């Protein structure tokens, strides 16, 4: 089976829950045909993900790499321009490893400021166009509509949400991984 590497933060690693409870594990279970390797770490900024990428590509030799990063950059002092360059590098590295990067749109909280939010959000469509890659919608948009799937911080999806995110992701990824 080919390998799909998930390079994400808390949203893919699972916030305050075990690896087996996070949606990537459920997806892996749902899929013998495709191996889903979760290389996500709670709190990771795009830079921290990029730092771990080289070893991951060499060790896992993935055919596809889902990039779900950037949400932690704002609070970590990174300007939209820095997030853009970091993601650009990640996409470059993924392609150079003969893997297909699958980028996911990320949306920061509204209390971050319109100036930042507009610039930040624009990063994703720009890179997807620049590298001609798939741009998946932010999976949390659907989760936000179900308070019963949100943890207390109003930021991370809870345990009950994972199976649904896994199904949602399976649907989005199906066409991309054949």
Q: In terms of Cα–Cα distance, which of 70, 53, 150, 61 is closest to 99?
A: 61
Which residues, 6+ apart, have CB-to-CB distance to 8 below 8 Å? 38, 39, 40, 44, 49, 66, 67, 68, 69
The coordinates were experimentally obtained by X-ray
Token reading at 33: 């045909």
**Resolution rounded to one decimal, in angstroms:** 2.0
Query: Is 72 annotated for ligand binding?
Result: yes
Which tokens is 79 given? 């300007």
* Pairing verdict, β 64-68 and 135-136: unpaired
Q: Going by C-beta distance under 8 Å and a sequence separation of 6 or more, which residues neighbour residue 88? A: 127, 130
Q: How many domains does the chain have?
A: 1
Provide the residue range defining the domain that includes 124: 1-178
Catalytic positions: 10, 153, 156
Please indicate if the annotation marks 43 as binding a ligand: yes
Q: Helix, strand, or coil here: 42?
A: coil
């Amino acid at each position: 089976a080919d390998t799909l590497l998930i390079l994400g933060d808390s949203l893919s690693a699972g916030y305050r829950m075990s690896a087996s409870a996070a949606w990537p594990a459920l997806l892996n279970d749902k899929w013998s045909k495709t191996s889903v390797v979760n290389a996500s770490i709670s709190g990771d900024t795009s830079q921290q993900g990029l730092a771990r990428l080289p070893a991951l590509l060499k060790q896992h030799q993935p055919r596809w790499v889902l990039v779900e990063l950037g949400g932690n950059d704002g609070l970590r002092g990174f300007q939209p321009q820095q997030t853009e360059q970091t993601l650009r590098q990640i996409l470059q590295d993924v392609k150079a490893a003969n893997a297909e990067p699958l980028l996911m749109q990320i949306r920061p909280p509204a209390n971050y400021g319109r100036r930042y939010n507009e610039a930040f959000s624009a990063i994703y469509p720009k890179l997807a166009k620049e590298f001609d890659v798939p741009l998946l919608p932010f999976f949390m948009e659907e989760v936000y509509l179900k308070p019963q799937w949100m943890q207390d911080d109003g930021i991370h999806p809870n345990r009950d949400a994972q199976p649904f995110i896994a199904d949602w992701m399976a649907k989005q990824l199906q066409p991309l991984v054949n």
